[PDB]
DNA sequence: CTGGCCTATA
DNA sequence: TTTTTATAGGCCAG
């Protein structure tokens, strides 16, 4: 968990209200992944839990700050998911909501950091509702998501929103060039793949990840011309599939943009592979395929337990069918 | 080590008892019957004290120190039984056994129950130096092939006279549930003291009750026998199999078919089976399938499997069982 | 002793409640006529006064002054409820205590008479969360409680309750609060707090409330933080992501001219400007609507549009009714399906692209 | 006080409908053929919990096992006030466990303190664990002379076939619009409460077959309308508008005339009528109409004031067409959440009608 | 009650089930008594009834016989309820181990009136893991004077390790005629007026169970005031109809819009969940489209519904079936938006009717 | 009253 | 060679 420089102003604005004591007790921060929401919060958390605060700052030498520094501080609750899992269950919320009625074990303020509100189960989000509307005193909540609209109706209305907008592209590319050494085109693409957020960008270069995009592109550069798309299985069938499916999605879209002669593309760095999609695929099928590729991505992330190999395999065989002349193509519903 | 079929056992327990009786198998009936055939002939040889002991990896190193001690002379002859874990003899219990291999009396008779072993499990020292001393019985159930013989055999041991056609109609109803087939005869000899089991006679005294595994079903789809399939589903339901398990096993094979049917235009059939490590006995079956099914049927197969998986885990639907009844017929054209 | 407005300004006498005048009427009417039921169920979308009203009905039942419809707020009993300390208003977090084993405790302690109040009033809130088994346990008690017991149930979402539970309650469905209803209220509150504000900014906030007073009070509180003390038109409109009128239409236009390169390139300057995407989609739905309308009678275009009005009519005269319906339809579906696509941007791009390739018929 | 509860029938005379159940019980009591396990099933509010008690009351009346209990002898009044030592009303939904069913059983042997029969009436019986249904099995097949079981539930299917086979199943039917109205009237009269005749038709209808649902609805009609059950009050409360303005728009729409559609909506809009609400009364009218085509007698009893005009519409418009309008008004609903402004959404959905109108499409350029 | 009165006390008296009785009979006769019997099959087919006969024939004063006398002290003693050495355990309410351990502490003492201590354990599937283990220890080494009769609807639940120690007899569902015959017998003896077809309607409705049958009759007799008429039984079975969704499909294909909208009304009485009717319909259409691809696609399951189904399958067009199916599925997708879920199903069938291929809807 | 175990619903 | 997950209700041995 690292601290990025574009947080300063967003932090100085948010503390302020707290520094006056008129801070809202339930902040929902909406930020892309890697935008550094967790650090912005940690900073707000540490400031609330410090007994001898030097202005905005947490001191380091008070009992409160010591405990915080060493993981255990009785009044800081982390609501993330069980190690093996990817949802955030109700029972976990209930511990936290009960313990909250005990006078602060260290006679201070209590903070609850819900790491990703999106992961709250249906039952979990509701259990969180009544406490969240009117918690005990000197209780402070922090929730974070990508997309507040995916979040329970009624929970969203108990919170104050704060938007963590990402820095201008230009700043972000200049930021990046100093952390990785890659082509200018590369950065720009990573950055654009990642909806604007540096560091989520930067994340791509650090992993096995960027090597895997190149592999998706290698394969794609074969499937297109030849019409063998079942051949993508290999590059897509990984646990990171939702992510790579998104790569695939953005390529398809760039191709569609070129069929309309658009200026920006997302995959700036492979303008070769983009042009070759615009060449061997009609707009009609470019678009239909963009359709199913996102749609499966949702189901792969949303349906608990669903089998990837089977679902990706259906998609690939089904795409090949669309490729045929005269087949009936899909059209969004309702 | 004299290996045996449970039928042959009664005879080689008469000749001579041997220090170590090994009952490995999966079938509940052939286990019990063999088990008891020994216990019975051991009483009759002076044996009063019968001790049983189920072995989990749970049995401490204090539980196995009360077994090695469980044999000292001179006590009226005692019959020590041991039951086994899913896995068979782990590295923890591969050694405990070694302790018991050398304390063997005419006074202490060992009986051991469990599944078939892995090949380096059987070849683990203790078991081979048990070898010339021990009898070992195969209790694997007979399959749709080997079965009628086993019936027309037991039929005769009970001196009843079965018909080519009655033998068929028993093997249909009780496939994989030998214990029920066994009582099927017991029940028919009480019905008719003639001992003659004409077809129409046997028809009236039967009820349908086969046990299959999901495998039997994919096998049946693979070979295109559909009336078989359908039976196999409806039995697999009334046993309460998690339909998810059906899905995932029909898929290991249905996706494998997809992938072979493609490469089958480029490289020969025989090379592909090898490339993929296709168990030898499965290999004939597969080809049959690859031949009858189009590269498009296979695709609709895959799509349809998917719709039922989403319908199961997303929509919480009931359809699941009858969506497979349909998927089952599609793979049989 | 600070608290968010959303919390501070909870109506503490019937008088202080905005709208829902049909529920307030029936309630006060029965409290007076003597027609008091044993199980009221209150429903409606988030933050429209469901549980604020439960809490008020309770005051009206227990008030040291009499069973009233206009409770005072000045007895041990009304203050005590205002603060949650009141002992004969058992308030239950249904969404949290969902288990039967728990609501069976609830029931075992119903028979017992009230402490210092006149009625034991159970307030089960978020009630649609109780296990299936829990609902059914209430069945017999809800239908035939002790004379000293009242059950006040509230939930966003009554769909979910067994039809047997509904059968047994009076159901008051609270309407969503009218745009003006919300604004007047925002006005009143910002005045009492002594906080500066600009008329038209309250206008954006009532819209943005999307029918809900809490939603709205929570937005306002957000205004006061980002705005540095004031709720200005300037501030709100930057925080909400509101649109300067041109950019919206420009897109509508380029969209129906099948002009791909420009629609795309227009969205891109819009992504720079940091426009809220659901808001673009919505203004576009609004324009498509005007247009379709004016094709009906020339008169339906507003006084309000003067600046656009020249470009509007043309779109009306050129583009066939049929083809505008498909445009609107397509962008409607896109707004629905927006929050599912991998970026918000990417979803407007997929949506526009789709509608783009409509232009020619045959 | 509360109607729903006050008017629980106290004799078989007072029960609405359920002839096929009453006639059987009655024929059986005087015929002396009395089962030991009666099971009662049907939707919420149709009189199972109260028929069960009436049965009990008649089984135990000091005058003799009779189908007309006397409602006066200690035993009768005491069952009416629910404090009869020998009517054991078991809330199945709280005694769900086995260890609870087991206590009930243990005390079956012991005889009755005051009555002819110990009557266990297990209400909401579908809630009992699998474990405690089976507990019930042999005792429910072969009880002691002096025991009877009255089981009642909303859905029977949840019960093991082993139970079902063991008892008489009386399935109560839901009540007809007429039957509900007639009651709602009788009561409101008896309880001296002014009412407009239509407000009752309106109520009986929204009851969706359930006599409680009805009484619960009246209870709050009385409150909404202030001691009066008036038409304005009921339709207010029910989301219904009074019925002309809904139809008028349909008509105007089939007749392709735009001005009037749009005007009729502007007028809907000064009244602040609720938008989803409207689109519904219309699918509602469009249905009854397509309905009337099919079977003529089908048209309701509640739309007398409108029948002249409705009947007309069915005669003059092709069924293919009507399914079209419904269709369009339906997706129109499906869409409404997402459309920019609930009004605009309705307006826009009617414009889709017009643009795709069968007989007079809107003018192409 | 008829269910109770007419429980057979003699082997002669038992309906069908002949492949069990004959094997019992003969085994008694020829000295082959297993230490333990298990009786299975469905509700109300004679499981426990035969268990009790076996106990009589096993202990009769005349001696071990297939033709117990029903008259000697021991035989009326059992008929009655109180026979010292017939220990009938209601296993569903005595399932814990504590109780099974005690039941069996007395297994070892010799019997105090007859040849045999007979433990009759009924609804035996309910016993815990632990009570099974204990039961099993006593069937692995059965005393000589003891016999065990185990009865249950669901045998699939006893350990493999117990079924392996019980001769298990599976009782068959009784047949329409078999049940109709016994209906006639009984009604006659009680002296009660009945029409022929009224009975054939009862037996059909019983769904293979002689209890569901006598239970249906007692109720019949009531509705008809002491007479079992077709005018009355017909009525009361319409009260009790599972039926409406198969019936709507028959009615829909045949174009019968009165019968179609009447059945929808019969469904409102029963108090149906509407999305539920739709989905049962879709599900039949499916099931049928498959008995088009093979005969074997109809259930061991289906039986009562079955006859109608194969006929539905024959006399329909398979291109048509996917037509009705499309319309039904869509009506479902539409149903939560239709104004009244009733209206929704109504308008969905009405749509099925206007676009009926075979006999379409009259236009002005 | 716990920890092992089965089940039902979404 | 044999499998979705979150929440709930429940039975039992000791
Ligand atoms: N009708 C109303 N009048 C005044 N304030 C309201 C109204 N509805 C909601 N509010 C505001 O919303 C806050 C929460 O209201 P609440 O009654 O809890 O809504 P809910 O129905 O969703 O529980 C209140 O504190 C009050 O500020
Ligand atoms: N057949 C009926 N006759 C008269 N009132 C009825 C009838 N059915 C239901 N009610 C009304 O509903 C109230 C509760 O009915 P109840 O018998 O509990 O229905 P349930 O079958 O769902 O338990 C009664 O007090 C009565 O006013
Ligand atoms: N084969 C049969 N012959 C005569 N009556 C039967 C038969 N089967 C069931 N019955 C009737 O059903 C009643 C209960 O039968 P029972 O044998 O207890 O069924 P179960 O198999 O479910 O224990 C008996 O009293 C008898 O009237
Ligand atoms: F936020 Be409310 F209780 F719907
Ligand atoms: F209100 Be009833 F018993 F469903
Ligand atoms: F007595 Be049975 F098993 F219904
Ligand atoms: Mg609330
Ligand atoms: Mg009731
Ligand atoms: Mg029985
Ligand atoms: Zn500090
Ligand atoms: Zn007061
Ligand atoms: Zn009386
Ligand atoms: Zn005798």
Give domain limits for chain B. Answer: 1-141, 142-211, 212-333
Continuous segment of H or E residues that includes residue A190:
helix A184-193
Among C241, C145, C186, residue whose Cα is nearest residue C9: C186
Q: What string of DSSP letters covers B247-268?
A: HHHHHHHHHHHHHHHHHTTTS-
CA-to-C1' span, D130 to F7 (A):
9
Maximum separation of any 2 CA atoms in chain A, in Å: 73
Please tell me the number of the ligand nearest to residue E79's CA: 13
Instruction: Chain A: give the shortest CA distance to residue C100, in Å.
Output: 16
Distance CA D129, CA C38 (A): 30
Task: Give CA B136 to chain center in angstroms.
Answer: 16
The H-assigned helical ranges of E141-256 are 160-163, 176-189, 196-205, 210-223, 230-239, 244-253
Among C119, C118, C128, C132, residue whose Cα is nearest residue C153: C128
**A327 and A216: one domain?**
yes
Half-sphere exposure of A214 (CA within 13 A, CB side): 8
CATH number listed for the domain at residues B1-141:
3.40.50.300
Beta bridge partners of C43: C155, C173
| Pocket (CB within 6 angstroms of ligand 1) | C 6-7, 9-11, 17-20, 46-52, 213-214, 217
Q: Which two tokens stand for residue A166?
A: 């990402």
The domain tally of chain A equals 3
Distance CA C41, CA C23 (A): 11
Task: Give CA D124 to chain center in angstroms.
Answer: 17
Helix/strand/coil for E44: coil
Cβ neighbors of D145 (< 8 A, separation 6 or more) are none
- Which residues of chain D (93-152) touch nucleic strand F at CB < 7 A? 130
Cβ neighbors of D186 (< 8 A, separation 6 or more) are none
Do A49 and A111 form a contact (C-beta atoms < 8 A)? yes
**A103 and A36: one domain?**
yes
Q: Which two tokens stand for residue A167?
A: 């820095």
Give the CATH number of the domain where residue A237 resides: 1.20.272.10
Do E194 and E184 form a contact (C-beta atoms < 8 A)? yes
**A160 and A172: one domain?**
no
Q: Which two tokens stand for residue C171?
A: 């159901």
Angle at C344 between CA C340 and CA C348, to 5 degrees: 100
- Range list of β-strands (E), chain C: 39-43, 89-93, 120-125, 149-155, 170-173
**A102 and A142: one domain?**
yes
Whole-angstrom CA distances from A81 to A44, A84, A115, A120, A121 are: 22, 8, 9, 9, 11
**A70 and A157: one domain?**
yes
Other CB atoms closer than 10 Å to residue B284's CB: what's the count?
9
Chain breaks in chain E (C to N over 2.5 A) after: none
Please tell me the number of the ligand nearest to residue E11's CA: 3
Do E132 and E101 form a contact (C-beta atoms < 8 A)? no
Q: What is the crossing angle of helices E341-354 and E318-334, to 10°?
A: 150
Cβ neighbors of A281 (< 8 A, separation 6 or more) are A224, A255, A289
Distance CA D165, CA D245 (A): 54
Which one of B251, B262, B299 has the shortest CB-CB distance to A310?
Answer: B251
Distance CA C156, CA D272 (A): 23
Do E98 and E125 form a contact (C-beta atoms < 8 A)? no
Q: Which two tokens stand for residue E272?
A: 């149906």
Q: Is D342 annotated as a binding residue?
A: no
Ligand 2: residue of D170, D175, D211, D217 to mutate (most ligand atoms within 8 A of CB) is: D211
Q: Any idea what DSSP says for residue D364?
A: P
Cβ neighbors of E127 (< 8 A, separation 6 or more) are E91, E95, E100, E135
| Beta strands at D87-91 and C120-125: parallel, antiparallel or unpaired | unpaired
**A259 and A314: one domain?**
yes
Q: Is the dihedral of CA D181, D185, D187, D188 positive or negative?
A: positive
Q: Which two tokens stand for residue A27?
A: 């902040």
- Which residues of chain A (154-213) touch nucleic strand G at CB < 7 A? none
Task: Give CA C305 to chain center in angstroms.
Answer: 29
Distance CA A222, CA A232 (A): 9
Distance CA E300, CA E306 (A): 9
Q: What string of DSSP letters covers A5-40?
A: GGGHHHHHHHHHHHHHT---SEEEEE--TTS-HHHH
Q: Tell me the CATH class for B212-333.
A: mainly alpha
Do C206 and C85 form a contact (C-beta atoms < 8 A)? no
Output the CA C125–ligand 7 centroid distance in Å.
Answer: 6
Distance CA C37, CA D1 (A): 7
Which domains, ranges and CATH numbers included, belong to chain D? 1-175 (3.40.50.300), 176-238 (1.10.8.60), 239-365 (1.20.272.10)
Among E169, E202, E138, residue whose Cα is nearest residue E51: E169
**A42 and A163: one domain?**
yes
- Protein contacts on strand G: list nucleotides below 7 Å from a Cβ: 1-14
Do A315 and A293 form a contact (C-beta atoms < 8 A)? yes
Q: Which two tokens stand for residue A113?
A: 């950091």
Against chain C, the chains showing at least 3 CB pairs within 8 Å are A, D
Do E209 and E217 form a contact (C-beta atoms < 8 A)? no
Quote helix, strand, coil % in chain C, to nearest 5: 55, 10, 35
| Beta strands at C120-125 and C149-155: parallel, antiparallel or unpaired | parallel
Cβ neighbors of A181 (< 8 A, separation 6 or more) are none
Report yes or no: D23 at the E interface, CB cutoff 8 Å. yes
Does the CB atom of residue C50 touch ligand 4 within 6 A? yes
- Asked: is B142-211 a CATH 1.10.8.60 domain? The reply is yes
Cβ neighbors of A254 (< 8 A, separation 6 or more) are A265, A266, A267, A274, A277
What are the phi and psi torsion angles at A139 (to 5°)?
-110, 135
Q: Which two tokens stand for residue C190?
A: 């910002």
Output the CA E48–ligand 3 centroid distance in Å.
Answer: 7
Cβ neighbors of E48 (< 8 A, separation 6 or more) are E39, E120, E122, E151
Give the CATH number of the domain where residue A75 resides: 3.40.50.300
Continuous segment of H or E residues that includes residue D150:
strand D147-153
Resolution in A: 3.4
What are the phi and psi torsion angles at A89 (to 5°)?
-80, 170
Other CB atoms closer than 10 Å to residue C310's CB: what's the count?
9
- Counting Cβ atoms within 10 Å, is residue A1 exposed (0-12), middle (13-18) or buried (19+)? exposed
Q: Which two tokens stand for residue B91?
A: 């590295």
Distance CA C58, CA E206 (A): 54
Continuous segment of H or E residues that includes residue A284:
helix A283-302
Among A167, A38, A28, residue whose Cα is nearest residue C274: A167
**A12 and A153: one domain?**
yes
C to B contact (≥3 Cβ pairs closer than 8 Å): no
Half-sphere exposure of A262 (CA within 13 A, CB side): 29
Does the CB atom of residue E170 touch ligand 3 within 6 A? no
Distance CA D166, CA D147 (A): 15
Q: Which two tokens stand for residue C346?
A: 């990417």
Three-class HEC string of chain E = CHHHHCCCCCCCCCCCCHHHHHHHHHHHHCCCCCCEEEEECCCCCCHHHHHHHHHHHHHCCCCCCCCCCCCCHHHHHHHHCCCCCEEEEECCCCCCHHHHHHHHHHCCCCCCCCCCEEEEEECHHHCCHHHHHHHHHHHHCCCCCEEEEEECCCHHHCCHHHHCCCEEEECCCCCHHHHHHHHHHHHHHCCCEECHHHHHHHHHHCCCCHHHHHHHHHHHHHHCCCEECHHHHHHHHHHCCCCHHHHHHHHHHCCCHHHHHHHHHHHHHHCCCHHHHHHHHHHHHHHHHHCCCCHHHCCCCCHHHHHHHHHHHHCCCHHHHHHHHHHHHHHHHHCCCCCCHHHHHHHHHHHHHHCCCCCCCCCC
Distance CA D176, CA E183 (A): 36
Atom 7 of ligand 3, residue of closest alpha carbon:
E46
Helix/strand/coil for A78: strand
Decide: CB of C100 under 7 A of nucleic strand G: yes
Among C216, C222, C214, C231, residue whose Cα is nearest residue C11: C214
Q: Which two tokens stand for residue B166?
A: 């009655």
Q: Which two tokens stand for residue E193?
A: 């007026």
Distance CA A92, CA A89 (A): 6
- Each as own residue / partner, the long-range contacts of residues D55-64 (CB below 8 Å, 24 or more positions apart, any chain) are D55/D25, D55/D150, D56/D87, D56/D119, D56/D121, D56/D150, D58/D12, D58/D25, D58/D29, D59/D29, D59/D34, D59/D116, D59/D117, D59/D119, D59/D148, D60/D84, D60/D86, D60/D87, D60/D115, D60/D116, D60/D117, D60/D119
Distance CA B269, CA B9 (A): 44
**A137 and A88: one domain?**
yes
Chain B contacts in chain E segment 138-197 (CB below 8 A)? 156, 160-161, 163-164, 167-170, 172
Peptide bond between residue E106 and the one before it cis (omega within 30 degrees of 0): no
Q: Which two tokens stand for residue B331?
A: 């793979």
Whole-angstrom CA distances from C202 to A157, C180, C220, C276, D113 are: 18, 10, 9, 19, 73
Q: Any idea what DSSP says for residue E154?
A: -
Q: Which two tokens stand for residue C4?
A: 């968010």
Do C4 and C118 form a contact (C-beta atoms < 8 A)? no
Distance CA D52, CA D59 (A): 11
The H-assigned helical ranges of D39-106 are 48-60, 74-80, 98-106
What are the phi and psi torsion angles at C346 (to 5°)?
-45, -20
**A323 and A217: one domain?**
yes
Atom 4 of ligand 5, residue of closest alpha carbon:
D44
Q: Any idea what DSSP says for residue B212?
A: -
Distance CA D326, CA D311 (A): 17
Task: Give CA D27 to chain center in angstroms.
Answer: 27
Among A181, A179, A200, A178, residue whose Cα is nearest residue A191: A200
Cβ neighbors of E32 (< 8 A, separation 6 or more) are B190, E26
What is the residue whose two structure tokens read 């009877």?
Answer: D148
Cβ neighbors of D105 (< 8 A, separation 6 or more) are D135, D136, D139, E93
Do E91 and E127 form a contact (C-beta atoms < 8 A)? yes
Q: Any idea what DSSP says for residue B153?
A: H
User: Residue A273 sits in which domain range?
Assistant: 208-334
Instruction: Chain A: give the shortest CA distance to residue D338, in Å.
Output: 10
């Amino acid at each position: 968990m690292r601290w990025y420089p574009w947080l300063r102003p967003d932090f100085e604005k948010l503390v302020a209200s707290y520094q006056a004591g008129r801070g809202h007790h339930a902040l929902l921060i909406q930020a892309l992944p890697g935008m550094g929401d967790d650090a912005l919060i940690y900073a707000l958390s540490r400031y609330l839990l410090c007994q001898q605060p030097q202005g905005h700052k947490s001191c380091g030498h008070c009992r409160g700050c010591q405990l915080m520094q060493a993981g255990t501080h009785p009044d800081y609750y982390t609501l993330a998911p069980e190690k093996g899992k990817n949802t955030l269950g109700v029972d976990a919320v209930r511990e936290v909501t009960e313990k909250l009625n005990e006078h602060a074990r260290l006679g201070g303020a209590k903070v609850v950091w819900v790491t990703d509100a999106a992961l709250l189960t249906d039952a979990a989000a509701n259990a969180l509702l009544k406490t969240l509307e009117e918690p005990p005193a000197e209780t402070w909540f922090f929730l974070a998501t990508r997309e507040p609209e995916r979040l329970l109706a009624t929970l969203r209305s108990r919170c104050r929103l704060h938007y963590l907008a990402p820095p201008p592209e230009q700043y972000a590319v200049t930021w990046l060039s100093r952390e990785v050494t890659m082509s200018q085109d590369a950065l720009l693409a990573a950055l654009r793949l990642s909806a604007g957020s540096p560091g989520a960008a930067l994340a791509l270069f650090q992993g096995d990840n960027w090597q895997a995009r190149e592999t998706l592109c290698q394969a794609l550069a074969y499937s297109v011309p030849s019409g063998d798309w079942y051949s993508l299985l290999a590059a897509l069938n990984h646990e990171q599939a939702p992510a790579r499916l998104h790569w695939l999605a953005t390529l398809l879209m760039d191709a569609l943009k070129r069929h309309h002669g658009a200026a920006q593309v997302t995959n700036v760095d492979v303008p070769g592979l983009v042009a070759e999609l615009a060449n061997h695929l009609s707009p009609s099928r470019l678009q239909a395929i963009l359709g199913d590729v996102c749609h499966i991505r949702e189901q792969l992330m949303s349906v608990t337990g669903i089998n990837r190999e089977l679902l990706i395999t259906d998609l690939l065989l089904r795409i090949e069918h669309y490729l045929q002349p005269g087949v009936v193509l899909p059209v969004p519903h309702l | 080590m004299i290996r045996l079929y449970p039928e042959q056992l009664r005879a080689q327990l008469n000749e001579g008892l041997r220090a170590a009786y090994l009952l490995l198998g999966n079938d509940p009936l052939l286990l019990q019957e063999s088990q008891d055939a020994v216990r019975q002939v051991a009483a009759a040889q002076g044996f009063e004290e019968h001790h049983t002991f189920s072995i989990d990896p749970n049995t401490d190193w204090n539980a196995i120190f009360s077994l090695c001690q469980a044999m000292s002379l001179f006590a009226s002859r005692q019959t020590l039984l041991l039951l086994l874990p899913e896995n068979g003899p782990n590295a923890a219990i591969n050694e405990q056994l070694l302790t018991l291999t050398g304390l063997l009396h005419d006074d202490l008779l060992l009986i051991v129950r469990g599944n078939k072993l892995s090949k380096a499990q059987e070849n683990a020292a203790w078991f081979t130096a048990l070898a010339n001393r021990s009898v070992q019985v195969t209790c694997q159930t007979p399959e749709q092939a080997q079965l009628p013989r086993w019936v027309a055999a037991r039929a005769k041991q009970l001196n009843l006279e079965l018909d080519d056609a009655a033998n068929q109609v028993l093997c249909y109803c009780y496939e994989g549930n030998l214990l029920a087939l066994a009582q099927a005869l017991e029940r028919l000899s009480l019905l008719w003291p003639d001992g003659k089991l004409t077809l129409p006679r046997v028809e009236q005294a039967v009820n349908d009750a086969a046990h299959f595994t999901p495998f039997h079903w994919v096998d049946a789809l693979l070979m295109g026998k559909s009336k078989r399939a359908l039976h196999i589903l409806q039995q697999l339901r009334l046993e309460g199999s998690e339909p998810v398990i059906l899905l995932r096993t029909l898929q290991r094979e249905l996706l494998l078919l997809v992938n072979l049917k493609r490469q089958s235009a480029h490289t020969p059939l025989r090379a592909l089976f090898d490339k993929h490590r296709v168990w030898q006995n499965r290999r004939g079956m597969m080809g049959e399938a690859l031949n009858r099914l189009s590269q498009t049927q296979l695709r609709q197969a895959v799509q349809l499997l998917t719709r039922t998986e989403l319908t199961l885990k997303q929509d919480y639907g009931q359809s699941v069982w009858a969506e497979l009844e349909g998927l089952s017929l599609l793979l049989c054209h | 002793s600070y608290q968010v407005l959303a919390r501070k300004w909870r109506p503490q006498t019937f008088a202080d409640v905005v709208g829902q005048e049909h529920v307030l009427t029936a309630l006060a009417n029965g409290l007076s006529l003597g027609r008091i039921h044993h199980a009221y169920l209150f429903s409606g979308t988030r933050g429209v006064g469901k549980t604020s009203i439960a809490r008020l009905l309770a005051k009206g039942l227990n008030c040291e002054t009499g069973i009233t419809a206009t409770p005072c707020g000045v007895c041990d009993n009304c203050r005590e409820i205002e603060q949650g300390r009141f002992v004969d208003l058992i308030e239950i977090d249904a969404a949290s205590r969902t288990k039967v084993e728990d609501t069976r405790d609830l029931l075992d302690n119903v028979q017992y008479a009230p402490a210092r109040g006149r009625f034991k009033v159970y307030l089960i809130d978020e009630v649609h969360m109780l296990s299936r088994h829990s609902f059914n346990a209430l069945l017999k008690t809800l239908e035939e409680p002790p004379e000293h017991v009242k059950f006040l149930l509230a939930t966003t979402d009554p769909q979910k309750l067994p039809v047997t539970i509904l059968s047994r309650c009076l159901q008051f469905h609270l309407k969503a609060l009218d745009v003006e209803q919300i604004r007047h209220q925002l006005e009143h509150i910002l005045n009492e707090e002594h906080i500066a504000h600009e008329p038209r900014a309250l206008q954006l906030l009532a819209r943005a409330a999307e029918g809900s007073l809490r939603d709205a009070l929570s937005l306002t509180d957000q205004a006061i933080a980002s705005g540095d003390g004031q709720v200005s038109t300037q501030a709100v409109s930057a925080m909400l992501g509101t649109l300067d009128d041109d950019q919206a239409l420009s897109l509508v236009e380029a969209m129906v001219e099948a002009n791909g390169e420009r629609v795309m390139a227009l969205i891109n300057e819009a992504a720079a400007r940091g426009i809220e995407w659901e808001a673009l989609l919505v203004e576009m739905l609004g324009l498509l609507h005007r247009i379709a309308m004016v094709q009906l009678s020339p008169a339906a275009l507003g006084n309000d549009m003067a600046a656009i009005e020249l470009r509007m009519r043309e779109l009306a005269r050129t583009i066939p009714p049929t083809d505008i319906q498909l445009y609107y339809q397509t962008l409607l579906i896109g707004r629905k399906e927006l929050p599912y696509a991998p970026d918000r941007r990417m979803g407007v791009e997929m949506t526009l692209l789709r509608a783009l390739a409509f232009h020619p018929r045959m």
